[PDB]
């Protein structure tokens, strides 16, 4: 059993990489429209993200159950909300991979412009998605080794900037675009939050993957908090640094700023390097997120709250069938990248699948208090405070999202409810049943 | 069976709670779409009957006070019960502002001063408290008053259906079959975004189950009867009016029956329709206030709402709760002192409308999860009807404004956080951790 567990370093890198992989290189561009004031947005986001990570860290220390959020929700609310949580999170997991692989293969267009052709891109994306499904089939040790390397590669430009970029940084440049939002301070900070709050999706990674982690009660907490802090530092330092090195006007326009900035400062080779590292960190995360999909689905299927096949494992314990299913699904959704008007269509689904993740977060936050009140001791005020901050993070993320996306999330909840009712009636155990027919 | 309410007032409470105010405004809202609304009415009424049958059957198997609240608590546990009651309660008393405003509106036919928004506000507050007080006097009282109000409100609706077919011209109805500019489906959809909300109130007898006489028998009958009444009148009145009045006049009009009546059979006819419409509108304030009281009481009795809402007088009436609802309604009724204040409050109201669909959904789920053992030979019917009721709730949301729904979602989240913060260590987990 322990022969197939993953150690602390890969898990931590899986969390940090699951978090940063997709957008760490695109953040300074996004925040360029608001300006330097974004640092206020970072400060607020990071405090809330620590809060959420501490919640997950403590919750997994008290219950290192596989499936993470799925397990915590089922524990304190029962089978229905477990079922719901897993559906939402699983969908979130594999639906979000489509964006990632497009971005990742996208970064590789630097070398092979052919990858800009929607057809070639789509096929390439499919192949890559399947590569990282097979690597998951080989086992979590494999996938976490690969993603560890990828994540480390992705950290080279980011840290290079965040350590040495400050020797070209200039505060005049940063403050020259302190607030280009045209809004007041709150509005600008808010507009920043609309970007920065989603930056830390994946905080729950090690918790969800607890069932393949070595000494989880020890390691999952450390990996959780550990990954989140790396993400935070890298985010603030990289975006702050770049905002003081490149003019706001240019920074806004670039579709690959570290890359645009790189290719034009230290030569073509520099740009090449940055593109490679970006693609590495991006495509590396496919593995982590695919892993998480498999895990949550398996954990739910083990309790009979998700189809049996997601529980069918090899001798190593890998849910191979589930992984292959997620592969087919991702393949089907990847077809949206074959045309400009085809990607426009899929977008809402992607953005909705992102809001899904927050229900698990919310239930995790609830679960810590509802399940672990007896372990707080008289540090209880602290726990309550941190958890309340965590709640605020979740709620505020949604408050600032698009009405349509959230609406469809709301619809999804109802649909999941009806699904559970129609699929699990007369299997489901009622808290307060009626008397015998 | 002394303080309890009989079948007739309850049925009239259901139909009255449904018909409420909108019954007189429907043709105007449908006029923008046109005669093709008939298809939407069809779709709406099938789903609405489905929902009522679900409620009918569920109340039969378990005539618990609080209705949906009780059903949801049964099958999903305290968290979703707490959630249901908060949502439905909010729905109940937030929804009353719009109602009393509309209702006092119709009375401006007699007293124009009622459109001075100040005077309007004051008047509305007073009326709200009138019905809080009548609810305090007791459920027999409130349901009697509403019964009468409901029979009065039917005078116009019925008369038109019956005598107005003598003035009905199909050439007029078909002149405006589809004035929506859309294809058939879109027309039908724009209809449904009006008509699906028409039947909010189906759950009334169920939630009131605790003050109903022989609820196991009467709440089902009342539940389905009320809906049948509502459906028939909705279709008949709107269809009739769409055939007697040109679409153009119909759209423009803010009070079609009233305007149509006034210039049909005199300044007296208008007065009668106005009076009856106001009766219908203001009569159901009582019902909804009652339902608020009931759901809150039922939840507080289970420790899933602040205990004061469970405090009662020697009759069992949640007096303090009713007063609290009165005060909140008063605080929120302050939104009608200007055209400016009025439109700020609209979102809250729409969201409040959406709140009611979560209870519906849970009730639908509860019937299957709880009563599967009572279906027997006819299981494929229960699954089929309950499925239609599911589709009813979900379609209603799909057709709503994105913002309204977003803010309902946010509310669910806030409710979750509140539950966790206020009930941790009172709350008992299905699968707890080992002791420290
Ligand atoms: N859902 C996914 N497959 N990925 C989400 C990655 C988000 C990076 N913060
Ligand atoms: N929530 C209220 N106070 N009223 C709801 C009225 C719904 C009429 N179908």
Describe this structure in words.
- It is classed as transport protein.
- The entry lists the keywords Membrane Protein, Exchanger, Transporter, AdiC-agmatine complex.
- The assembly is dimeric.
- Crystal structure of the L-arginine/agmatine antiporter AdiC in complex with agmatine at 2.6 Angstroem resolution.
- The structure is a homodimer.
- With about 425 residues, chain A is mainly α.
- Chain A has one domain.
- In chain A, about 70% of the residues lie in helices and about 0% in strands.
- Chain A has helices at about 10-20, 25-30, 40-60, 70-75, 80-95, 95-110, 120-140, 140-165, 170-175, 185-195, 205-210, 215-245, 250-255, 255-265, 270-300, 320-335, 340-355, 360-370, 380-400, 405-425.
- Chain A is globular and about 75 Å long.
- Chains A and B meet through α4, α5, α18, α19 and α20 of A and α4, α5, α18, α19 and α20 of B.
- The complex binds agmatine (2 copies).
- The site of one agmatine has 12 residues of chain B, from α5.
């Amino acid at each position: 059993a322990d022969a197939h567990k993953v150690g602390l370093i890969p898990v931590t890198l899986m969390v940090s990489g699951n978090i940063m992989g997709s957008g760490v290189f695109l953040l300074p561009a996004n925040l360029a429209s608001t300006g330097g004031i974004a640092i206020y947005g970072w400060l607020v986001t990071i405090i809330g993200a620590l809060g959420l990570s501490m919640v997950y860290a403590k919750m997994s220390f008290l219950d290192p159950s596989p499936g993470g959020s799925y397990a915590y929700a089922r524990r304190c609310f029962g089978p229905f909300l477990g079922y719901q949580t897993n559906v939402l999170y699983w969908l979130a997991c594999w639906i979000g991979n489509i964006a990632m692989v497009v971005i990742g293969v996208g970064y590789l267009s630097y070398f092979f412009p052919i990858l800009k052709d929607p057809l070639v891109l789509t096929i390439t994306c499919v192949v890559v998605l399947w590569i990282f499904v097979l690597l998951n089939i080989v086992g979590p040790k494999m996938i976490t080794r690969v993603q560890a390397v990828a994540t480390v590669l992705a950290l080279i430009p980011i840290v290079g900037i965040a350590v040495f970029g400050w020797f070209w940084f200039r505060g005049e440049t940063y403050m020259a675009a302190w607030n280009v939002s045209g809004l007041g301070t709150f509005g600008a900070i808010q507009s920043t939050l609309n970007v920065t709050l989603w930056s830390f999706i994946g905080v729950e990674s090690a918790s969800v993957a607890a069932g393949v982690v070595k000494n989880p009660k020890r390691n999952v907490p450390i990996a959780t908090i550990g990954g989140v802090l790396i993400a935070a530092v890298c985010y603030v330092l990289s975006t702050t640094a770049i905002m003081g090195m490149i003019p706001n006007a240019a920074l806004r326009v670039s579709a690959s700023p570290f890359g645009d900035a790189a290719r034009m400062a230290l030569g073509d080779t520099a740009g090449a390097i940055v593109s490679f590292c970006a693609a590495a960190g991006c495509l590396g995360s496919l593995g982590g997120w695919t892993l998480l999909a498999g895990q949550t689905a398996k954990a739910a299927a083990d309790d009979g709250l998700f189809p049996p096949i997601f529980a069918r494992v090899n001798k190593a314990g890998t849910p191979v069938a589930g992984l292959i299913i997620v592969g087919i699904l991702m393949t089907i959704f990847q077809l949206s990248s074959i045309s400009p008007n085809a990607t426009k269509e899929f977008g809402l689904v992607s953005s909705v699948s992102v809001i899904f993740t927050l229900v698990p977060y919310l239930y995790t936050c609830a679960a810590l208090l509802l399940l672990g009140h007896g372990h707080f001791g008289k540090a209880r005020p602290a726990y309550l405070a941190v958890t309340t901050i965590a709640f605020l993070y979740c709620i505020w993320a949604v408050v600032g999202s698009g009405a349509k996306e959230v609406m469809w999330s709301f619809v999804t909840l109802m649909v999941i409810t009806a699904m559970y009712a129609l699929n699990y009636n007369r299997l489901h155990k009622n808290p307060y049943p009626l008397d015998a027919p």
